[PDB]
Design a protein around this ligand. Structure first.
Ligand SMILES: CC(=O)NC[C@@H]1[C@@H](O[C@@H]2O[C@H](CO)[C@H](O)[C@H](O)[C@H]2O)[C@H](O)[C@H]2[C@@H](O)CCN21
Length: 633
């Protein structure tokens, strides 16, 4: 017989270790590891030891490691033993480590993590968590120091028109932290509450309380959450109810997507929104978008902007000048609030009388138009937001192919359309992936989460390490899978109730029930009415992005769709996903039911809910309808 038995190494340091014991992988990679003698084992009695200042980081790391390892790991202050993980903040090491980098020393003093900042220590602890959560509790001795090549590393998350649940955003933020990603551009609506903007409080929106909460979580993770309110284009969700601010074409037809930048009350409305955001985001940036103002048309159809340009910026001024002038004016405005402005690059147009301010960060996604190398020559600060790093729920042209990018040698200087710039350009800030909803019924947010996994690891690797230590993408993939999600994602209770037969009094206006609940692979439920044999759907109402956003829309019974299939079944996506329901448990015990696509909450209508949509249609009082959570708590 083989005699196979667990090795069962003693906890702490051992001078003996096999020469080729695996060093568990991390993402980002920690390049330039220097091997030392022996190995260190996490085991019974191992503690995370730190100063008082780092106590919170130590306690959190101990708790997490206890969960992953099944060993009771406690935090402590005072002296560390070779059994222990030590956290050290040494701010004198800024040259070696920078604002975000860290050093690991693994040896007879235990596992030491050193950073020059709180975020640095935290980022070192992410590698420690990654290394210890792969079923191996012995780590080869040695040392490494690592810091990110680029300062901004992250994602555009367009939580726009449709709502991305705050629970999803919290998970997203935990995933970003695991991956040492420090940037999220969040295009979203913060619920407008002043008399002069409140008619734009249509769904999707986020409450001030909800934003304050995820910004606080982000900041603890070293993540800069930058808001975007796109302007002067893509303004439908803001101007629908304010036709007075919409731009009319030569024939007098207004577009709810277009802000009239010649109307000073329209510009003031935009600035009012900036002021509303300022109370809840902590970032020093403002992103105003400036993409696709004239999509589906041209400035020739808006002669009024030419007229405005000439008045404002002198004879010969063009609509491009007026557009750039609006950008420069928003720059002036947010600077005076201590912020730096950011735009999308298609906002950079050929001007005559006005020139675009060079203190504006350019996030470059669109390679038609002024080329990267040209902007380099100009001296602009640039972030790589290539379309190669896009996902869309509906536009299948936009699915990140991490394999292809890894194998083809993309790096952060590889701008849109494969146009290379010097990756060491001293004003290249970094790079990001971008997560766009577009026609939104094709994929649930949970399917989005599954799909983006590989691409998030790819961008993490190339923005921090800018190296390819895995021989191929497939080698990377095997290690990223072994590393897995951070604790918070593993803990999220996607489906808190068992499949089965339920009485659901909230649904009595639809059927007396009972209801058969079954779970879906994306972490939702289908709810079948045992009376009619049909399934509950949120199907009907006014939409944005082909998803029902109408506050007060009522659910309905429809023939049962097959909820067991994946997102490649595009032909049935709408019937399927309109039949998916998210069930959450209260603090504590009570359950809420939300349409998976809309992320509003079912409630019995009282007739006292207050919202712009409800001024013009209300569900019959006492019937069950969807509402944003803030109108029904
Ligand atoms: C920078 C970006 O690529 N802009 C152009 C478009 C994206 O447009 C956004 O669409 C969302 C809704 O999905 C918002 O309305 C936002 O204001 C727009 O900027 C679009 O998502 C994406 C891809 O479809 C391809 C082109 N970009």
């Amino acid at each position: 017989s083989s005699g196979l038995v667990p090795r069962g190494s003693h906890m702490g340091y051992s001078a003996t270790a096999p020469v080729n014991l695996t060093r568990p992988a991390t993402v980002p990679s920690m390049d330039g590891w220097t091997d030392g003698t022996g190995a260190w084992t996490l085991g019974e009695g191992t503690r995370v030891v730190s100063s008082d200042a780092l106590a919170a980081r130590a306690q959190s790391l101990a708790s997490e490691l206890t969960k992953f390892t099944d060993v009771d790991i406690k935090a402590a202050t005072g002296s560390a033993t070779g059994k222990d993980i030590s956290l050290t903040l040494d701010a004198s090491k800024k040259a070696e480590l920078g604002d975000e980098g860290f050093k690991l020393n693994i040896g007879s003093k235990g596992l030491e993590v050193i950073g020059a900042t709180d975020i640095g220590v935290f980022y070192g602890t992410r590698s420690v968590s990654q290394m210890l959560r792969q079923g191996q509790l012995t780590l080869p001795a040695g040392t490494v120091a690592t810091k990110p090549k680029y300062k901004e590393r992250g994602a555009t998350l367009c939580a726009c028109q449709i709502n991305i649940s705050t629970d999803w955003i919290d998970r997203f933020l935990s995933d970003m932290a695991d991956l040492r990603l420090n940037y999220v551009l969040l295009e979203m609506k913060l619920k407008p509450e002043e008399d002069n903007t409140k008619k734009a409080a249509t769904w999707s929106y986020y409450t001030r309380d909800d934003v304050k909460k995820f910004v606080k979580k982000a900041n603890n993770y070293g993540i800069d959450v930058i808001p975007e309110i796109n302007s002067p284009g893509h303004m439908n969700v803001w101007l629908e109810n304010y036709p007075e601010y919409q731009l009319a074409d030569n024939s007098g037809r207004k577009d709810p997507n277009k802000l009239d930048i010649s109307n000073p009350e329209a510009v003031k409305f935009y600035k009012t929104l900036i002021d509303e955001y300022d109370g809840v985001f902590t970032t020093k940036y403002w992103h105003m978008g400036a993409d696709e103002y004239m999509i589906g048309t041209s400035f020739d159809n808006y002669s009024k902007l030419k007229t405005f340009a000439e008045k404002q910026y002198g004879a010969g001024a063009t609509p491009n000048d007026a557009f750039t002038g609006f950008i420069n004016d928003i720059d002036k405005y947010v600077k005076a609030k201590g912020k730096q402005l950011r735009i999308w690059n298609d906002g950079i147009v050929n001007t005559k009388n006005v020139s675009l301010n060079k203190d504006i960060v350019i996030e470059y996604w669109y390679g038609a138009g002024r080329k990267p190398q040209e902007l380099v020559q100009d001296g602009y600060t640039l972030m790589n937001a290539t379309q190669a790093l896009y996902w869309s729920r509906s536009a299948q042209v936009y699915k990140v192919n991490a394999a292809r990018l890894y194998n083809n040698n993309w790096n952060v200087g590889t701008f849109d359309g494969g146009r290379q710039i010097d990756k060491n350009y001293d004003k290249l800030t970094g790079a990001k992936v971008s997560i766009w909803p577009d026609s939104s019924y094709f994929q649930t947010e949970n399917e989005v989460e599954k799909e983006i996994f590989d691409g998030m690891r790819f961008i993490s690797q190339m923005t921090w390490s800018d190296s390819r230590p895995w021989a191929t993408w497939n080698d990377m993939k095997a290690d990223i899978d072994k590393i897995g999600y951070p604790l918070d994602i593993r803990e999220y209770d996607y489906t808190p109730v068992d499949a089965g037969i339920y009485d659901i009094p909230q649904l009595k206006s639809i059927s007396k029930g009972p209801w058969e609940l079954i779970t879906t692979p994306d972490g939702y439920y289908q709810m079948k009415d045992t009376v009619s044999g049909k399934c509950l759907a949120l199907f009907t109402g006014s939409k944005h992005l082909d998803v029902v956003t109408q506050v007060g829309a009522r659910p309905e019974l429809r023939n049962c769709a097959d909820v067991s299939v994946g997102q490649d079944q595009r032909n049935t996506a709408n019937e399927r996903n309109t039949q998916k329901w998210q069930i959450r448990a209260d603090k504590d015990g009570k359950y809420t039911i939300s349409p998976a696509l809309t992320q509003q909450r079912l409630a019995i209508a009282t007739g006292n809910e207050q919202n712009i949509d409800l001024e013009t249609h209300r569900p019959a009082a006492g019937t069950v309808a969807q509402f944003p959570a803030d109108l029904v708590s």
